[PDB]
């Protein structure tokens, strides 16, 4: 390694010493990738060893198996689990690949050349080259596009994906006709993020997801080919800082925005995140409680339509501010929730009274009861329910954990963008160490502001 | 000479102005002034707003039998939920007033204004040849404001759960939040309280030590005094280290308390310790945590008088 005198960076900033050491930086990146893959494999194996297939996944606090199940591995109709071997296979494959990646990282960090700008000119790069950086960006864009097309092929040819909107309970299906229409695909991006619209979190079918992934894979391949054979235009050079920390800051900002989007999507979406694996969402639990109470009261004998509440609005059914028939009570805020177990009861103008009378199947009632029981509410002690509850339950929904953790990570990475962008701009300007003390810019300015 | 745009950008990015109108300023100023104008007009006079969505409004305007302490800009109606509710989407202006549009308008413009204010802080730091990390410190109150006004409504699914823009609204929101989430028992609120108390302590101590050492730039005698006092010699003898610690403590505390707020926004409450100490037979022994639970239970039953209609408060 190095020391402070040679580099100028203290131990608590030691990784900053690798900015101009391509070999060591590459070794560090490879070792970190090996760490990521190792955690993936180890956690997959841990969840497999503790998984009881009889109980639902969301009732055991599993966060990685739901992804593989959504991919459509070892899952039958309604989310029932047939066998758990594919999860074991994925875990062991990630584990061994992580072993290989870790060996590569430790080699490139300890034995490999410190700087590879002259021995391996293809892999060498200067942070201000402005042409090799685009080459690397194009290579990785092509790789990302290949990954997206791999997902598309998995959903289209090799087996299928878990469609939760299939008739009855959802099941594995092949997406024979993905939605490739440009208008439909690009309507999501420009849609408003507020309530009712929800931006890309409003995808409600697997066809749209697969078509969008086709689009993004093709666009990424084309963009990679573009960037390999091109250098940034003068207007691009005019409005960017060309240094390693600047690129790091750009990536930090983008990935923080990605973390926020992931938080919102995990909390709200239930198509790419089936409730049979991740548990019911926030609105889903309340809607399910209202539906179950309405069904029970109607079975006991009552007029659900003519059931005026204490405030006069309506105990069971009322009207939304747009005009649709919705469940009444404090759940009015969740009136735009949509779920496979509730849609068959919806007509052109909201919930249909006639369908609510004699068109409710037993599976819908059972799913509603199960979801209303396991609300996303929880506690830091893994208690469950409202804060004023006894210690009798050990449930916190995986959706809550995912949302909280990824929001925290996104916020910290936005802070990282701020810090690193500011420092990169200052260092490129040249005053990141301090004021000159002999050519101070303020002293040459007109006083009184 | 130079074109129109060159002169315009020279004027905008000029350090000779009394107040720096940065490129972030060009958005900060209109949004902040719009929010200020709407807030002032609504506070002075605005009809009662149906916060609960149950056809009963609450008044928070001075012209409607209120004072400074009890006045507030009532949050958006529950029936609206998270829907965007601009002026042009309402049939009439009075309907916009009734449903609680001004709160949404003020919140949106104010959040944009504070984000651009942080950006402008960075910009003027850059234009004067300074190290640009004042904005990083300023982000902590910005993060707290975003969690209070935006993240919590998103997690709870409605803007009616946000903080009202009024003094009594703050206390009502705090009582509500403690009742529903047990804020006091969360480690992140404890860290925020620790950060605030430590900020006050270090502010007072640093002020006293520096002022006492400014005899007829701090001398080394203050370090010796501090070492003799609390038996922490060499803990802080570098001025840069001391001032960095002063900056770092409260910022980290506020970051963590804002993160705890945003975490509870997604129904991840604090610690639960009721019914923990149990007799040998099986009887439950009360603890101070159980008295806190009793207070929370009392807060919860009178939470919404006529809004709920189901046994469990899932919303």
């Amino acid at each position: 390694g190095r020391d402070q005198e040679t580099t100028g960076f203290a131990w608590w900033s030691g990784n900053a010493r690798l900015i101009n050491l391509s070999g060591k930086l590459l070794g560090a990146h490879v070792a970190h990738a090996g760490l990521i893959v190792f955690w993936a494999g180890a956690m997959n194996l841990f969840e497999v060893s503790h998984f009881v297939p009889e109980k639902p996944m969301y009732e055991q606090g599993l966060i990685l198996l739901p992804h593989i199940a959504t991919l459509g591995y070892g899952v039958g109709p309604g989310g029932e689990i047939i066998d758990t071997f594919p999860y074991f296979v994925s875990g062991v494959l990630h584990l061994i690949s992580s072993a290989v990646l870790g060996f590569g990282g430790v080699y490139h960090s300890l034995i490999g050349p410190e700087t590879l700008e002259e021995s391996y000119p293809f892999f060498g790069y200067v942070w201000k080259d402005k042409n090799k950086m685009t080459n690397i960006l194009g290579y990785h864009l092509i790789m990302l596009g290949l990954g997206a097309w791999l997902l598309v092929w998995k959903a289209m040819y090799f087996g299928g994906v878990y469609d939760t909107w299939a008739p009855g309970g959802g099941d594995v299906r092949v997406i024979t006709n993905p939605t490739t229409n440009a208008a439909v695909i690009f309507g999501y991006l420009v849609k408003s993020p507020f309530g009712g619209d929800g931006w890309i979190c409003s995808v409600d079918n697997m066809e749209d997801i697969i078509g969008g992934h086709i689009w993004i894979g093709t666009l990424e391949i084309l963009g990679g080919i573009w960037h390999i054979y091109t250098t940034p235009w003068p207007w691009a050079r005019r409005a960017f800082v060309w240094s390693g920390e600047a690129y790091l800051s750009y990536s930090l900002g983008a990935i923080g925005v990605m973390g926020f989007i992931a938080c919102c999507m995990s909390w709200f979406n239930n198509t790419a995140y089936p409730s049979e694996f991740y548990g019911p969402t926030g609105p889903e639990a309340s809607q399910s409680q209202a539906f179950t109470f309405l069904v029970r009261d109607q079975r006991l004998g009552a007029n659900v339509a003519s059931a005026q509440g204490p405030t006069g609005l309506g105990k069971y059914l009322m009207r939304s501010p747009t005009g649709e028939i919705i469940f009444g009570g404090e759940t009015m805020r969740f009136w735009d929730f949509r779920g496979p177990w509730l849609e068959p009861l919806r007509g052109p103008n909201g919930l249909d009274l006639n369908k609510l009378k004699n068109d409710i199947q037993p599976w819908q009632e059972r799913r509603a009861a199960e979801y209303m029981t396991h609300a996303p509410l929880g506690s830091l002690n893994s208690v469950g329910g409202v804060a004023t509850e006894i210690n009798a339950v050990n449930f916190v929904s995986p959706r809550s954990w995912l949302a909280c953790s990824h929001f925290c990570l996104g916020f910290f990475f936005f802070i990282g963008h701020l810090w690193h962008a500011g420092r990169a701009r200052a260092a490129a300007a040249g005053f990141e160490k301090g004021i000159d003390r002999f050519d101070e810019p303020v002293l040459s300015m007109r006083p009184l502001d | 000479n130079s074109s129109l745009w060159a002169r315009f950008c020279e004027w905008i990015t000029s350090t000779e102005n009394r107040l720096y109108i940065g490129w972030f300023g060009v958005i900060m100023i209109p949004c902040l002034l719009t929010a200020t104008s709407v807030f002032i007009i609504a506070f002075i006079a605005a009809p009662p707003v149906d916060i609960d969505g149950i056809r009963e409004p609450v008044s928070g305007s001075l012209l409607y039998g209120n004072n400074i302490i009890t006045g507030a800009v009532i949050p958006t109606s529950n029936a609206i939920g998270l829907h965007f509710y601009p002026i042009w989407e309402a049939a009439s202006l009075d309907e916009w007033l009734y449903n609680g549009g001004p709160y949404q308008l003020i919140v949106c413009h104010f959040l944009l204004g504070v984000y651009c204010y942080m950006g402008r802080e960075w910009e003027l730091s850059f234009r004067l040849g300074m190290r640009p990390w004042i904005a990083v410190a300023y982000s902590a109150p910005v993060a707290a404001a975003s969690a209070v006004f935006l993240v919590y409504p998103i997690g709870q699914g409605s803007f009616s759960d946000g903080m009202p823009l009024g003094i009594s609204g703050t206390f009502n929101f705090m009582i509500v939040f403690q009742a529903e989430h047990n804020i006091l028992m969360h480690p992140f609120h404890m860290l925020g309280v620790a950060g605030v108390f430590g900020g006050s302590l270090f502010s007072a101590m640093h002020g006293s030590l520096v002022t006492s050492s400014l005899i007829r730039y701090n001398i080394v005698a203050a370090h010796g005094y501090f070492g003799r006092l609390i038996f922490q010699y060499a803990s802080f003898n570098n001025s840069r280290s001391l001032h960095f610690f002063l900056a770092a403590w409260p910022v980290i505390g506020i970051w963590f308390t804002a993160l705890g707020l945003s975490t509870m926004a997604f129904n991840l409450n604090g610690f639960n310790f009721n019914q923990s100490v149990v007799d040998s037979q099986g009887r439950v022994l009360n603890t101070w945590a159980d008295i806190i639970n009793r207070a929370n239970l009392g807060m919860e039953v009178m939470h919404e008088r006529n809004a709920h209609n189901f046994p469990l408060d899932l919303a």
Binding site: L448 | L62, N67, I68
Partner: peptide, 30 residues
């Protein structure tokens, strides 16, 4: 009546803030 008093107090406070920001004593020899 009381609303007018509150409005006058707030307007006066804002005016004092404006005067302090703009009609300030120029700082010399910082």
């Amino acid at each position: 009546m009381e609303a007018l008093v509150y409005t006058f107090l707030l307007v006066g406070t804002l005016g004092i803030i404006f005067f302090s920001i703009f009609f300030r004593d120029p700082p010399r020899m910082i």
